[PDB]
From a paper:
In Gram-positive bacteria, nitrogen homeostasis is controlled by an operon encoding glutamine synthetase (GS), a dodecameric machine that assimilates ammonium into glutamine, and the GlnR repressor. GlnR detects nitrogen excess indirectly by binding glutamine-feedback-inhibited-GS (FBI-GS), which activates its transcription-repression function. GS generates glutamine from glutamate, ATP, and ammonium by a mechanism that involves the initial phosphorylation of the γ-carboxyl group of glutamate by ATP and the subsequent incorporation of ammonium. The structures show FBI-GS binds the GlnR C-terminal domain within its active-site cavity, juxtaposing two GlnR monomers to form a DNA-binding-competent GlnR dimer.
To visualize the active, transition state (TS) conformations of the GS proteins we reacted them with l-methionine-S-sulfoximine (MSO) in the presence of ATP and solved the structures. In these structures, the Met-Sox-P methyl group occupies the ammonium substrate binding site, thus mimicking the GS transition state and preventing further reaction. Structures of the Pp, Lm, and Sa GS-Met-Sox-P-ADP complexes were obtained to 1.98, 3.50, and 2.95 Å resolution, respectively. These structures were all dodecameric and densities for Met-Sox-P and ADP were clearly observed in each enzyme. The GS TS structures all display the same contacts to the Met-Sox-P and ADP. The resultant ammonia would then be in an ideal position to attack the γ-glutamyl phosphate intermediate. Thus, the GSI-α·Met-Sox-P·ADP complexes mimic the tetrahedral adduct, formed before the generation of the glutamine and inorganic phosphate products. Strikingly, while the TS structures are similar to each other, they show significant differences, both global and local, when compared to the corresponding apo and FBI-GS-GlnR bound states (as apo and FBI-GS-GlnR conformations are the same, the state will be referred to as apo/FBI-GS-GlnR). Although all GS active site loops are altered upon TS formation, residues in the D50´ loop undergo the most dramatic structural rearrangements. In the TS state, Asp62´ and Arg316 are repositioned to provide an optimal active site architecture. Thus, our structural analyses indicate that GS enzymes from low G + C Gram-positive bacteria adopt two distinct states, the active, TS conformation (herein termed the “A” state) and the conformation adopted by apo GS/FBI-GS-GlnR, termed the “I” or inhibited state.
Residue numbers in the entry:
A (entry chain O), B (entry chain H), C (entry chain A): 3 to 444
Write the structure that this text describes.
């Protein structure tokens, strides 16, 4: 743990002229408040209020006042605000003025369900994500447009890769913030890039994910580009999906490692699988909270459409990397980077360890092309489709209780009313698709 | 009736020059062909054949060849500027290479189910439809714009209803084609138009419907405006429905008319409703065979939203016009003018005739305005909500096996497939609404 | 030879910041992935993998996860990567996750055929390339226009060769990267360029080739010019193909130099050419693997048109440069820079190592201008005619089962699929040519 006092003098060895307290709203969006180095004790002693009412996902305007308490380990300095004022960073948890924490804080609802594996013995919850992102050219307005940075491809090179000089500026801006970056490259769709790093403690891997998305964006609008974490911005091309590499640690040993099994996977991992897969239909409404996230979960674009799993195969809902070692992990790939990392982790922790506790037995590893299977030749194998509309997936989540009770009373009730009414805008609205399709033939 | 010896007489009488053989495809699309008056006798020998694989939903390409047998009762000369190109049409029944009526021919389907009221004792099946349509301007190159001629409202007056020479010229041309016209006016939303005509038996009111769209499609395009029967071409204004006013007749009798029961309504009628009411869930993919009509089917714009009935009231599924007697009608507002009036009539007959052989005890009249209740108030009565989408409205249909038997087994087999892919063709696509709300946001 | 101890040294000596792991897909398309020096150990431990399903022609999606084993004798720093993000490269080999190598990987297909020359006693199957490219200007939005920056001819000078300082800044950039470069000059057709570099043993020239292209694409786009290797980009002017200057060696002695035989040429030398002459029809699908290069193979433009050889003459399929000694070389000419430098060598090795176990008494020099002979004489001497299209070269390929074996089999069946697709995706399409010559005509 970082100290409170040596943080006060952390600003004098680097003359930090501002600190940015930052937390996260219900929809995954990073809100912020900036304060000078002048107010540093006023925040470290937890006396910084705000207006709760206007942050979508919090209390009503009657009980508006809400305080902010910093997590003194999430101290980095913003490397690009040299020369103006060296700007630090600190992540906060949201507290009601009763000094009772807020059960609607997205970072509390993981800070609590990470203690249920405490009651049953595991060291850590290791998340290494793969947040994929597209990049679009800007204009004279510097207001983004739907023309991608290159008509490139998977692993292709300059001249065909025009973010080669951009990703590289993004990775060295992230590494200056104390990361360990695995690789950098261009994904299979045009303008689609992927920067993956090394796994971390569940919450400090989640904190690190809200870091990444802010660096990828500010350092692109510095390259003439704009970075989108929208899952399916085009038709008929790979979507951007934030893979979920999960692995529990236990006393300096990967909980998933069976040293001399055939699939070298402990029967902990095997009842971990049946956890999410049983519950897959419920919780994905959370892990893909935008209507468009389903417009991406279609057959053919390396995205999963059916609830299943296999080994080193990129069709199913979960993939097992053929390399395990101490990096042994199972790859839930039905996560896209519009969900809340704090909330996808909490949900999938619960309904995931619910499979070892209940000891659920795991279904068949479907080792072929899941997209190449008849409507009725996969219906004999029991595997069935992931829900197609947000209305459908919200019904099958609200139905589910095991994940509904790790979503908090205040978050779920504040969530489905936001996802439904977001979806009614859709169902009521007519798009220019429908004009094209009908207006002249009828 | 009309003998073959009339048609020749009328040709050499009215001096027609070319003959058209119209029929209607699976989706509602009147498709015809031209022959000289030198062919007049050959078509009446019913020895004139077209490409069967080439009209949607009819047949496959290995049994392409299919015959056209005209209906001499339909003869009407086309009255536009054709002195030398004077026309004459005849709506065709479709037959096989073995002369048996074609299962797919929807003109056959209507008549087929019509013989199911010849055994419940009813002379006719009258239908007075209200096909409401929109008027759009045309560009310099005669392509449909997205502006509408005027910005008037219900019943408005010149100079704020541009289509007042338009409908004038629409109505007159119809009055030449054997029509008797009731009225011509402006509807709720701007550039919308209602033209009404006296009821007729189905296979002749619907022939007065397929004739209607054409002679508004063309006469409106003679005033330089393209006309649509798209349900809701603009979000936030009344989708144009095509109200379905019907009546069964009994030895010169309006079989819904007995001036005693609760409203001066009969029992063959009070029973009819419970058939619709019960089977209404399962016939909305036929009354509304398009993704877009489910966008008129949000409430507030005088369209049906839930499955209940009332009097004098334009909010429910079925309104009953106060005027009664011969004017005693059952008004069904769920149909919109994209639908197939040979499949729509065929189906509702087998919904409501399933309510004279059981009569199924109709539910309560909600004389409120049903748009103004709550999810706890709909459930208080227990009123069925019309389905969500072309998605549900497709599964809700392959349940009602009395309705499936109103389309036939080869018309339903070529109507689920043609909507399934058309439904899938929208489910997968990404339309601009998805990028506005998310691209610059996530 | 270089050791993994040497590369831990240079990264801290050069102070490089990223390592790029590179390979080639089936089509000659370079695909590489960038990683920090912070992961220099994981690749030298071979513990870095990728997605095989996305490398065009590597594998199919069910068994994707595949390893990356790096080659150290391939290490070079990039020189254009300032002191801010300096870059070191390493060409790799592909290993299936079970640590067995990949039969579809082209680099090891060569290694296996270069072992077929250890059974015949040959230290080196040396190769010198002549990749010829075009230069197209760049528009305002960095898009390669249809203008050639210069309108010159052979060996011309400033000011009638724009890319004079271009071919300078490439050479230096090549010269920083351990290259030995012969000659930098303007080629025949306008806006054409050649850069000759001295030979190296096959797998290291194939490295030096795919590398050399990357250095001209990226440098040419510094001066803002698209660098392309399309064989016949313009019709009616010289095609830019990649000559193949090959020579065998045994104990520091060229195996083709014996100043007794008629042309100062050896026996294995003369014998080699029969191994190509007959087999030439077969591999002309691997040396010209594109629709476009079969318009280059036409007569007139100093490119092989029929299968023939001769001395100091630049019409035939094989040229033999007058200069002999250690520069005693055989010049194959069908190849275009769109061919796979790994496939071509293992093809031509097994092709021309077939003329040393069989040797087929190679035919005699038609040292005429074979560009100027009518059909009455081409089948007089019996000179085989080259295939006329991709689709012809393919059927001509699946018969010489030794070239087929030269390719392995995975590469082969992965090859016939896509080119038959490519050949068929061009057989069926319609291009504005046929629209001029027939539309207003017929
Ligand atoms: N034991 C583990 N638990 C969780 N995540 C891991 C583990 N080992 C590796 N990872 C993560 O897997 C990710 C690999 O990224 P990438 O190479 O894009 O995956 P893929 O092989 O699916 O393409 C990294 O983010 C890394 O942190
Ligand atoms: N007895 C009847 N049976 C069936 N349809 C009828 C009957 N009387 C009138 N109609 C139809 O009602 C239509 C007129 O409807 P409209 O004036 O729009 O009434 P509303 O405004 O109540 O819908 C006419 O087209 C006519 O054919
Ligand atoms: N003995 C040899 N073995 C292999 N390659 C050779 C030999 N001699 C020359 N080369 C190659 O020939 C190339 C020079 O080609 P170039 O100068 O264009 O000759 P030409 O103009 O006759 O084609 C060099 O790239 C070199 O690698
Ligand atoms: C090549 S991809 O394999 C693409 C997967 C897809 N874009 C998605 O996850 O949505 N995934 P990864 O980065 O793990 O290799
Ligand atoms: C009030 S309206 O009823 C307009 C109908 C509405 N736009 C609909 O068809 O959904 N039609 P009409 O007055 O002729 O009965
Ligand atoms: C006689 S030329 O040979 C002209 C090149 C020709 N257009 C070709 O197809 O290679 N080239 P080079 O002198 O490099 O051998």
């Amino acid at each position: 743990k970082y100290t409170k006092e040596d943080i006060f003098r952390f600003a004098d060895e680097q003359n930090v002229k501002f600190i940015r307290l930052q937390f996260t709203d219900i929809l995954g969006i990073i809100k912020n408040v900036e304060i000078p180095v002048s107010q540093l004790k006023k925040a470290l002693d937890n006396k910084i209020m705000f207006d709760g009412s206007s942050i979508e996902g919090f209390v009503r305007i009657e009980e508006s006042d809400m305080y902010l308490f910093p997590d003194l380990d999430t101290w980095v300095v913003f490397p690009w605000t040299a020369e103006k004022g060296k700007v630090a960073r600190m992540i906060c948890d949201i507290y009601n003025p009763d000094m009772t924490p807020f059960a609607g804080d997205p970072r509390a609802n993981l800070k609590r369900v990470l203690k249920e594996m405490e009651e049953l013995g595991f060291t850590e919850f290791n998340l290494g994500p793969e947040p994929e992102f597209f990049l679009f050219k800007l204009d004279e307005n510097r207001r983004p447009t739907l023309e991608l940075n290159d008509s490139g491809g998977y692993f292709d090179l300059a001249p065909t890769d025009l973010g080669e000089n951009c990703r590289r500026d993004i990775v060295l801006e992230l590494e200056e913030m104390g990361f360990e970056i695995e690789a950098s490259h261009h994904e299979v769709a045009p303008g689609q890039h992927e920067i993956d790093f090394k796994y971390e403690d569940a919450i400090t891997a989640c904190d690190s994910i809200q870091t990444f998305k802010l660096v990828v964006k500010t350092i692109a609008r510095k390259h003439g580009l704009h970075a989108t974490f929208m899952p399916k911005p085009l038709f008929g091309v790979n979507g951007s999906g934030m893979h979920f590499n999960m692995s529990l640690f236990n006393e300096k040993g990967n909980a998933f490692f069976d040293e001399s099994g055939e699939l070298e996977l402990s029967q902990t991992a095997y009842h971990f699988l049946a956890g999410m897969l049983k519950h897959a239909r419920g919780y994905t409404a959370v892990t893909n909270p935008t209507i468009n996230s389903f417009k991406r979960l279609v057959p053919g674009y390396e995205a999963p459409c059916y609830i299943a799993w296999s080994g080193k195969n990129r069709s199913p809902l979960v993939r097992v990397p053929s390399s395990r070692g101490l990096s042994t992990r199972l790859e839930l790939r039905s996560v896209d980077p519009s969900a809340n990392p704090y909330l996808a982790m909490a949900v999938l922790l619960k309904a995931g360890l619910s499979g070892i506790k209940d000891e659920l037995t795991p279904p068949a590893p479907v080792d072929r092309n899941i997209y190449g299977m008849n409507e009725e030749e996969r219906e004999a194998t029991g595997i069935y489709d992931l829900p197609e509309s947000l209305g459908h997936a919200l019904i099958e989540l609200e139905k589910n209780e095991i994940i509904k009770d790790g979503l908090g009373e205040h978050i779920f009730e504040h969530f489905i009313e936001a996802k439904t009414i977001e979806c009614d805008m859709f169902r009521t609205a007519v798009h220019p698709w429908e004009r094209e399709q009908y207006l002249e033939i009828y």
